[PDB]
Design a protein around this ligand. Structure first.
Ligand SMILES: *C(=O)CCCCCCCCCCCCC
Lengths: 207, 40
């Protein structure tokens, strides 16, 4: 359990394109996917500029804590796919010892400025001595669909990484009633070169 | 101008002579883990 605080563990995260060939035939391409130990630490100050500032921003959230809820994920995104019959989606799954109502805020940022936010509310299901939360096939917002289209139409691969330098996603999972930060995940991106999607997961620390 | 301009973001890389975006420190020049740019 890498992306895990004391109160919530994200066991699954995937962004995908599903193409319907015919009513019984689907092709799914994963752009990125995640699916106990101590992780390498990253000085959070090294990335504050890439994420929203002010009240409710990354610094404010980190300072409010708890410190063990904050993670940095470095994705290598797989863009090698055929881009009417398309569905762009994001699926995620979480586990907690606690029965909570959770809110998941996902902010897409450019040059550390918020462009779009998706906000989802999730209720618990009891499962094998714990509580499970699932965001199932959440539609990828149009901004992200547009972004992916523009990335793929770039003539060169180095151009994609250059654009991605200033594209980030901040995911904040909160207990709706208490406002406790259960998970806060900062996402940074490069394009995958080796033929698929990969990731490194880090813990965010004060220094 | 607008920092969140999607067209401007891509134009800056496609047509560098007409780039009009904030200037940033590239990630590779930052104090980050050794394998941050080396995929598993
Ligand atoms: C719109 O609803 C914004 C929500 C973003 C969800 C995060 C999905 C991660 C996108 C994968 C990036 C691939 C592009 C390089």
């Amino acid at each position: 359990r890498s992306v895990a605080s004391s109160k919530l563990w994200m066991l699954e995260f995937s962004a995908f394109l599903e193409q319907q060939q015919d009513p019984d035939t689907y092709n799914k391409h994963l752009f990125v996917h995640i699916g106990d130990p101590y992780l390498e630490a990253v000085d959070i100050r090294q990335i504050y500029d890439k994420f929203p500032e002010k009240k409710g921003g990354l610094k404010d959230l980190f300072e409010r804590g708890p410190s063990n809820a904050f993670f940095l994920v470095k994705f290598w995104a797989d863009l090698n796919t055929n881009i009417g019959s398309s569905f762009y989606g994001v699926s995620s799954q979480y586990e907690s010892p606690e029965n909570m109502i959770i809110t998941c805020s996902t902010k897409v940022c450019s040059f550390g400025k918020q462009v779009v936010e998706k906000v989802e509310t999730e209720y618990a299901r009891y499962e094998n001595g714990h509580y499970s939360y699932r965001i199932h096939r959440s539609p990828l917002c149009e901004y992200m669909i547009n972004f992916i289209h523009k990335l793929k139409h770039l003539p060169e691969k180095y151009m994609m990484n250059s654009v991605l330098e200033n594209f980030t996603i901040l995911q904040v999972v909160t207990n709706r009633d208490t406002q406790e930060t259960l998970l806060c995940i900062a996402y940074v991106f490069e394009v995958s070169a080796s033929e698929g999607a990969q990731h490194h997961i880090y813990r965010l620390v004060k220094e | 101008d607008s920092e969140t301009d999607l067209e401007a973001l891509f134009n800056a890389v496609m047509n560098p002579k007409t780039a009009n975006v904030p200037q940033t420190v590239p990630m590779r020049l930052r104090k980050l883990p050794d394998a941050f740019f080396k995929p598993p």
